[PDB]
Structures are given as C-alpha cells and as structure tokens.
C-alpha cells in the first residue's frame, strides 16, 4: 500500500523464466514498509497499457508514491537498484 509497482512484460520465448527471476530480485530488496509489485501481462490489460503510454518492454512503473516513474529495458533492475534507496516514502 505504501509503494506499488507494476511489471509489464511480454510473453515471447524466455520471458517466462526471466520475469519470475527479476520479480524475486525486487521482492528481496530491503524495505520496512509494505509494497505490492504486481506483474501485469501486457496481453490481458490493454486499458492499462494506454494509461501509462507504454511502448518499450519490459517496464516497471512506480505508481503509488508520486512522482510516478517508469523503468524499462531488460536491465531495469539496475535502475530499480539505483532508485530503491530514494523510494524511502514515509507517508
């Protein structure tokens, strides 16, 4: 509820194994508040694809604690690691 993340991923070959792996990475990141990180397959929620003007994939959107951010590319963990200390949202 404090931090909410959305992981938009395609479903081409190898995306299945990789999307589970990066999800484990984010979930192992140290935090004292509760966050969600919901994985959204792009094929099942097109209305959501439009709201965030998505183009490149994979994409992780920082939604709840404004300012909203989108980190995209297959190296998005590198920027998740960069931004994670900054996401110290109190309330």
């Amino acid at each position: 509820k404090a931090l909410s993340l959305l992981l938009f991923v395609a479903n081409r070959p190898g995306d299945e194994e990789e999307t589970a792996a990066i999800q484990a990475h984010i979930q192992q990141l140290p935090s004292n508040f509760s966050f969600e990180l919901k994985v959204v397959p792009i094929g099942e929620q097109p209305y959501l694809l439009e709201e965030y003007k998505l183009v490149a994939t994979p994409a992780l959107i920082k939604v709840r604690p404004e300012p909203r951010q989108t980190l995209a590319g297959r190296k998005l963990l590198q920027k998740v690691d960069y931004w994670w200390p900054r996401w110290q949202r109190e309330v």
Partner: protein, 231 residues
C-alpha cells in the same frame, strides 16, 4: 494483388489503384514535405468516403496538436473520435520520466496498436514519424527489428498502414537509419525543392510491390489536402 483508394487527388492515378491493400507503405520525405499531411488524409478519406475507421499512431506530435493543426483544412478530427471512427494512439514520450536501460522490444506498442485495431474495427493505420522512435531509443538495430515485426502484425490483421519516415537530404538515401531495407515493398518519396523563390513539391512512387505505377516525380500542391497534377 489489390489496392485500396486513398482518395488523395491524383495519387490513385499514379499508384494505378491506390496503396497495396493489407500492407504498409513507406512515406519518406524531409521536413515540411507533406508526410504527416499525407498520413492524415489517408485516414481522413478512409473514414469520410468509406465507413472504414482508422488508427493514428503518433510518436512526436501531441494528439491535440494533431487535431488542432488539422482544422486548417476543415477536418474536424475531434468529431471523428466522438463517433468512434478515429483513434489517436499517443506513443509520444514522457518528459523526464521515460528511462530505458538495456535491451528492449516494442511489444507493448505492438499490443497497443493491435488492441486499438480490434476495438475500433479499423482497416487503415498511420504511424507518424518512424524516424522518431529511432531518435528516442538509442538502439538502432533493436528498433529496426521491431518495426519489421510491427509491419507483420499490421499485415496479419489485414489493415493497410502508412509509416512516415524522415529523410537526410531531398535527393539522397531513401530513409534515415535504413527502414527502407525492412519495409521494402512500398516506398513513396515526397520532396520540396526551393529554387530561388519558387517552391516545387513533387511526389514519386519508388516501389509498389511490383504492381504497376507511374515513374518519376509528379508535382503536387497543398489546397485542403494533397493534389497531384502531372499525368
């Protein structure tokens, strides 16, 4: 085999029917040559003369800026959106909040265009400024590959697409970054030569999937649409 008419005055005579149906056609030109105008008129005429809806994918111009500038030709692009016959897919970047790191694919864009095609029952699609995606993402080879994949799902859905590309020079290579070599079946070249004070604009049909067309450049003018007049 077949072609759909563009109803752009004169163009259907150069193309000997129109643009190849169920495929994407490359509209390549420098700045201010009429690329966006050709792309909008192809969608506008499809909606107005026939009841075929159209999707407009823009990477640079804002959707309201697309509609606002369209008023200069008496084209109420807003009124078509309200009737569900036009849809502008906003694929323009976010200011200082779009970060890409590493390899990527345009799957979310291909899914967004596809979803719009199926919801609005469209048969015409215009993608304005393909050169702009190359400029926004510093992976020339990756973007080039994904446009090739996009052209196939556009062809798979049966819609006839127009992809506009920026050019380097008037008389030079066919397109920047080489999208000619992937969208290689259909190429229309728009020019805009500044001789002293007279500005002569010409259109040329380079390739049309081997179908019959007219060779060379033909002069056109801009009077509430595109009007080609040498044949």
């Amino acid at each position: 085999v077949k072609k759909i008419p563009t109803m752009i005055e004169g163009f259907d005579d150069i193309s000997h029917g129109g643009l190849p149906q169920g495929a994407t056609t490359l509209v390549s030109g420098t700045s201010g040559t009429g690329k966006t105008l050709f792309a909008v008129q192809f969608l506008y005429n499809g909606i107005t003369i026939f009841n075929e809806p159209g999707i407009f994918v823009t990477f640079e111009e804002s959707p309201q800026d697309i509609i606002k500038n369209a008023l200069s030709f008496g084209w109420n692009l807003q009124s078509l959106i309200d009737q569900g016959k036009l849809f502008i897919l906003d694929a323009s970047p976010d200011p200082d909040g779009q970060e890409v790191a590493g390899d990527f694919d345009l799957s979310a864009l291909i899914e967004r265009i596809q979803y719009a095609i199926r919801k609005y029952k469209a048969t015409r699609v215009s993608i304005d400024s393909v050169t702009a995606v190359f400029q926004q993402y510093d992976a020339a080879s990756v973007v080039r590959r994904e446009i090739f994949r996009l052209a196939f799902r556009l062809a798979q859905l049966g819609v006839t697409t127009i992809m506009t590309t920026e050019r380097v020079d008037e008389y030079g290579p066919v397109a920047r970054f080489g999208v000619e070599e992937f969208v290689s079946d259909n190429v229309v070249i728009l020019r805009n030569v500044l001789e002293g004070e007279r500005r002569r604009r010409t259109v040329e049909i380079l390739k049309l999937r081997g179908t019959t067309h007219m060779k060379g450049e033909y002069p056109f003018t801009i009077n509430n649409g595109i009007n080609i007049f040498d044949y």
